[PDB]
Amino acid sequence: MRKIGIIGGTFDPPHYGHLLIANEVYHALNLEEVWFLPNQIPPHKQGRDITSVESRLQMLELATEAEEHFSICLEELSRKGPSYTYDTMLQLTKKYPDVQFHFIIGGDMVEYLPKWYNIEALLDLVTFVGVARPGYKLRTPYPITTVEIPEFAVSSSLLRERYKEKKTCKYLLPEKVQVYIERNGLYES
Amino acid sequence: MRKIGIIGGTFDPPHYGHLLIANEVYHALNLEEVWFLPNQIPPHKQGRDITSVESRLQMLELATEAEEHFSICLEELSRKGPSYTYDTMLQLTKKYPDVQFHFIIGGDMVEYLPKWYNIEALLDLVTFVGVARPGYKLRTPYPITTVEIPEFAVSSSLLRERYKEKKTCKYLLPEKVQVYIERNGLYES
Ligand SMILES: O=C(O)c1ccc[n+]([C@@H]2O[C@H](COP(=O)([O-])O)[C@@H](O)[C@H]2O)c1
Ligand SMILES: [Mg+2]
Ligand SMILES: [Mg+2]
Numbered sequence A, B: 001m002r003k004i005g006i007i008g009g010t011f012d013p014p015h016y017g018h019l020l021i022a023n024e025v026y027h028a029l030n031l032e033e034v035w036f037l038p039n040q041i042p043p044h045k046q047g048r049d050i051t052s053v054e055s056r057l058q059m060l061e062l063a064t065e066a067e068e069h070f071s072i073c074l075e076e077l078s079r080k081g082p083s084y085t086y087d088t089m090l091q092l093t094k095k096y097p098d099v100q101f102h103f104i105i106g107g108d109m110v111e112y113l114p115k116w117y118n119i120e121a122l123l124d125l126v127t128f129v130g131v132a133r134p135g136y137k138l139r140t141p142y143p144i145t146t147v148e149i150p151e152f153a154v155s156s157s158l159l160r161e162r163y164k165e166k167k168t169c170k171y172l173l174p175e176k177v178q179v180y181i182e183r184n185g186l187y188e189s
Helices: A016-028 A053-064 A085-095 A110-115 A119-125 A156-164 A175-183 B016-028 B053-064 B085-095 B110-115 B156-164 B175-183
Strands: A002-009 A033-038 A070-072 A099-106 A127-132 A145-148 B002-009 B033-038 B070-072 B099-106 B127-132 B145-148
Touching: A002 A016, A002 A085, A016 A033, A016 A053, A016 A099, A016 A127, A016 A145, A033 A053, A053 A070, A053 A175, A085 A099, A085 A119, A099 A110, A110 A119, B002 B016, B002 B085, B016 B033, B016 B053, B016 B099, B016 B127, B016 B145, B033 B053, B053 B070, B053 B175, B085 B099
Parallel strands: A002 A033, A002 A099, A033 A070, A099 A127, A127 A145, B002 B033, B002 B099, B033 B070, B099 B127, B127 B145
Antiparallel strands: none
8 A cells, every 4th residue: 555645725825835745755754755735715705806716726826836746635625515534535536546645744733633524534535644843742632653853834814914024925925926926916915 | 233143062963953042033933144154073082983073064054055144153152162152152241242042952852951051141142032832831940032943853863863763854954054964974973
């Protein structure tokens, strides 16, 4: 069974925290590759001006085009939302029976796991990987592999606020992506 | 009074943690510049496999060129050995009495300020800026400015360890600095 890591999120926008995490785990547990899985736009969000899935995908290709081992997984975008990880992993496990999936999660998300949908049944479908700062320890009743990393506390939401507020975004996300964001007016048009 | 930031460290090697913090604080508190204050090495350690003050400055030069607002301060390097921040700031407070420096530190260090040599006298020479990830609160007995930043937990010590064990260093520090390290064979000596 080949080992593949998957990092899910809105990727609105994708950033160095996503890349760093992927790289870190890729090497730490020696994975064949890491797939970036964008989730579907959940209901009741089109009430303001929201980034289309199309742009999130373009920014995601910009961010990962330089890595052969980083791919985009459209499984969740191929269906309606919200995107429950359990439903998703159930389809990916059926599509790739020879793969052991490692679902990568940021240390700050670990506590929220008991609230995920069918998380216990989801535990049979994959192996969770919680990422944490060197020396810190993730707490959870669930079996989870930990990978210590120079964790980068950047997120898509903070980047959205920064752009809306004409704040700095230096070092926060790939250059080819900030270009795409300004050229197209995202979060600050 | 012009506001100036100071970031101290071995810068052995300088990395993205340093640059991210500088830019974040430079903006958050509207500073005119940020100065990188490298530590002087103990006199008796200039062989085995320890980087020279020489190799450190060139690396730091690489990491800061393209930033007009980032410059190197050599005040501590003008002494035969390591000297306390209090002694260094007291000297700078005098050479530039028209400046109110902002000594910047990682949030995880704030806890130990009480053990700093002359911490008390020092607190009246500079204004401390504790850096913190969003959410995390900075617990301290002192009247310190806190700036919320998407913290990057990379350190020189973690990097020196990565190169020694041929591990990945991606996204952790500038390419110009990485090129220099591998070519001159530092750490991986
Ligand atoms: O399955 C769930 O009920 C569930 C609830 C919250 C978050 N997640 C997972 O968390 C991943 C990244 O975090 P987030 O907050 O963008 O959803 C996302 O891709 C989902 O797979 C999953
Ligand atoms: Mg700016
Ligand atoms: Mg590698």
